[PDB]
């Protein structure tokens, strides 16, 4: 229908802070995007947190 | 739920209101994706009077590569169903839509049936 | 001290039975709702009563 629907643009520029640009179709023309799923720390964030931070004995030996 | 049961349910919905009489037969259509069908039938004796189809006009003007039902072959088969029952004694007829809503090629099919002076 | 005696007196029913000669306009069935649906050569009424349109017998199927 006309006159009610928002402008669904085909040229939507997805800009990453790591100098990567991909094309998607959406509302805005430009999208400044953070941690988006390709090269996201979901393989290393669960490696750094809940998997390696727990220590009580090797913390004790570093002060003696 | 499905599309075919929706068409058949719409056609049974139409069939309650319109009935074939021995004075006025009823002509029903079937717009299959390859062919149209049109049936001048008489319900009180349970037999057809004047049937035509895309397999009747398709001797001269048809393209099977295209989508078979077009508005132009609806104009042509309304033309031949308008001049096929006129030579039989069928002037005053009771048209129903065949379970399909009226805004389509059944516009020019019904008006094409009106073109040869049928009392619609 | 009773809360009763509230009769109604209203009557209905089958007026013309099967295999009987009807008249044009003869009320065949007076009914509440539709126990008897209108077939052919009959008509349904304003309060769902069934009258005959033409002469002849009446049937049930």
């Amino acid at each position: 229908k006309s006159d009610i629907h928002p402008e669904f643009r085909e040229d939507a520029k997805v800009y990453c802070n790591g100098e990567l640009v991909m094309t998607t179709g959406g509302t805005q023309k430009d999208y400044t995007v953070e941690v988006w799923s390709g090269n996201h720390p979901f393989y290393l964030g669960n490696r750094s947190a809940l998997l390696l931070d727990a220590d009580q004995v090797e913390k004790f030996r570093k002060k003696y | 739920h499905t599309r075919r049961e929706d068409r058949t349910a719409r056609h049974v919905r139409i069939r309650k209101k319109v009935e074939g009489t021995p004075e006025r037969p009823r002509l029903c259509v079937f717009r299959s994706n390859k062919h149209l069908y049109v049936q001048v039938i008489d319900d009180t004796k349970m037999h057809t009077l004047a049937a035509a189809s895309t397999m009747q006009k398709a001797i001269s003007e048809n393209i099977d590569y295209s989508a078979g039902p077009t508005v132009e072959v609806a104009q042509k088969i309304g033309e031949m169903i308008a001049k096929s029952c006129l030579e039989k004694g069928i002037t005053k007829v009771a048209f129903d839509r065949g379970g399909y809503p009226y805004h389509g090629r059944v516009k020019a099919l019904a008006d094409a049936a009106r073109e040869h002076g049928l009392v619609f | 001290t009773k809360n009763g005696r509230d009769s109604k007196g209203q009557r209905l029913g089958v007026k013309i039975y099967g295999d009987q000669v009807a008249k044009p306009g003869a009320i065949i069935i007076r009914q509440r709702g539709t126990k008897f649906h209108p077939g052919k050569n009959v008509g349904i009424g304003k309060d769902h009563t069934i009258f005959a349109l033409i002469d002849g017998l009446v049937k049930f199927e």
Binding site: F8, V14, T27, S37 | - | -
Partner: protein, 175 residues
């Protein structure tokens, strides 16, 4: 553009993974549907306008304020009241917003659970639901101080034990 990535690579390995015999028996995603569960939108008139403008910029098209199916006592619900504002988008918008669930919901969730093998498991026709990301990053987020409801139901054609989970697994939904 992920429908072209949907055509040639992730359909035939579902064709040979289940060991079919014909092409069209392989299932596909049919439609997704978003609703905004709101109990107070006749009073909050600018929250319903926030659903129209803001939620119409969340999804592809304008959403529909939903009239009440019934009236339950206790709540402020009458026959025909706005109980949530929903939208049903379909087509290439469907691929574009499951795409926006790959891009805007999978890496930007504070939780790291993703698709769940212990949720949306058993259905007659398999449906996947999420309660996440009340505002997309296209909308300036700090205006709406209310965590409004938002559910995105994906639909499929399959009636099996494997195929929808592998369908979201082949798309951008790790866990």
């Amino acid at each position: 553009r992920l429908k072209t990535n949907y055509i040639e690579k992730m359909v035939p390995l579902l064709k040979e993974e289940f060991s079919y015999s014909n092409i069209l028996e392989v299932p596909k995603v049919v439609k997704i549907v978003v609703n905004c569960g709101i109990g107070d939108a006749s009073q909050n008139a600018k929250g319903l306008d926030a659903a129209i403008n803001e939620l119409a910029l969340i999804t592809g098209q304008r959403p529909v304020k939903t009239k009440a199916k019934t009236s339950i006592a206790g709540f402020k619900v009458r026959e025909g009241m706005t109980l949530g504002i929903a939208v049903t988008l379909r087509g290439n918008l469907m691929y574009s917003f499951l795409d926006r669930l790959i891009n805007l919901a999978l890496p930007r969730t504070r939780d790291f659970q993703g698709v769940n093998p212990n949720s949306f498991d058993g259905h007659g026709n398999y449906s996947v639901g999420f309660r996440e990301q009340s505002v997309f990053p296209e909308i300036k987020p700090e205006i709406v101080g209310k965590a409004r409801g938002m559910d995105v139901c994906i639909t499929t054609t399959a009636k099996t034990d494997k195929e929808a989970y592998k369908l979201l697994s082949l798309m951008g939904m790790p866990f």
